[PDB]
Copies of this chain bind each other. A is one copy, B any other.
């Protein structure tokens, strides 16, 4: 059952928060430039 499954099933995004953390340079995402596991939490933290 259910071969071709992505975690982004049924989601339209306003922006990418993965790219918003790596490209921060103090542009309000400077608080997430720490948090070594920010990508892993941002990937599956919506359920």
Question: Which residues of A line the B interface, CB within 8 A?
Answer: 3-5
Residues of B within 8 A of A4 (CB): 3-4
Interface of A (DSSP majority class): loop
> A39 to nearest B CB, angstroms?
16
Give the nearest-CB partner of A3 in chain B: B4
Give the nearest-CB partner of A5 in chain B: B3
Give the nearest-CB partner of A6 in chain B: B3
> A5 to nearest B CB, angstroms?
7
